[PDB]
Amino acid sequence: ALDTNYCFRNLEENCCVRPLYIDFRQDLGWKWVHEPKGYYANFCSGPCPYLRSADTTHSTVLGLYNTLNPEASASPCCVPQDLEPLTILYYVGRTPKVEQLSNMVVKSCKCS
Amino acid sequence: ALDTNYCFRNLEENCCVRPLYIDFRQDLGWKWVHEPKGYYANFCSGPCPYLRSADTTHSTVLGLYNTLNPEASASPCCVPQDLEPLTILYYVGRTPKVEQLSNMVVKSCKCS
Numbered sequence: 001a002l003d004t005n006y007c008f009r010n011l012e013e014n015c016c017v018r019p020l021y022i023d024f025r026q027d028l029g030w031k032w033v034h035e036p037k038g039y040y041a042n043f044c045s046g047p048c049p050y051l052r053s054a055d056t057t058h059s060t061v062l063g064l065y066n067t068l069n070p071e072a073s074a075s076p077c078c079v080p081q082d083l084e085p086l087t088i089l090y091y092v093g094r095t096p097k098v099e100q101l102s103n104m105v106v107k108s109c110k111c112s
Numbered sequence: 113a114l115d116t117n118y119c120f121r122n123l124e125e126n127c128c129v130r131p132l133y134i135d136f137r138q139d140l141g142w143k144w145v146h147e148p149k150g151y152y153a154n155f156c157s158g159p160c161p162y163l164r165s166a167d168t169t170h171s172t173v174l175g176l177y178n179t180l181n182p183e184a185s186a187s188p189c190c191v192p193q194d195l196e197p198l199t200i201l202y203y204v205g206r207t208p209k210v211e212q213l214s215n216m217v218v219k220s221c222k223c224s
Binding site for chain 1: 132134139140141153155156157167168169170173174176177180181186188189190191192195213214215216217218224
């Protein structure tokens with residue numbers, strides 16, 4: 001499937017992982033989050049040609065229907081598939097808390 | 113979550129289920145499939161405003177990041193969530209086969 005390592009060495013217009021660094025404090029406005037200061041959420045973006053890592057069979061039917069009947073604009077989307085969690089530190093009053101939020105960073109995408 | 117029954121009584125620009133009837137024979141070109149002749153695959157389509165049935169937390173972060181930093185066009189997509197299978201009949205030579213393909217028709221969508 002298409003993941004970072006791949007989507008990163010080589011560029012693809014079609015569904016692939018795009019890197020994205022978010023900074024909790026700014027563009028998000030999470031001040032409670034005290035550290036790390038930002039992470040690489042990355043995102044999935046790209047058109048989904050017929051067969052490019054399909055999810056369900058419905059995703060295949062669609063991709064196809066769409067392909068040979070373009071008027072459609074029915075096409076399956078490119079979303080994340082695999083995503084690791086992220087750990088962050090914040091304080092409850094003045095006692096630090098280190099927790100790991102799940103699914104904060106994507107690693108692979110897929111046309112669903 | 114947004115499913116047919118809902119997305120169908122009321123119209124929504126945002127992520128919802130859209131009905132779609134596909135005909136195996138035509139626009140798909142499956143002749144082997146002998147009956148039914150077509151079904152309602154439906155599809156998911158719509159923008160994903162911040163919070164509209166989010167999938168992962170990453171989907172929330174994104175939706176938000178995206179919301180207050182629109183330049184982004186990062187936004188999470190609207191894909192199917194729940195989908196029932198479909199049964200079809202075809203012949204291996206002249207001996208009918210009734211099988212059920214899984215995930216051929218969507219019922220609910222979600223922003224992922």
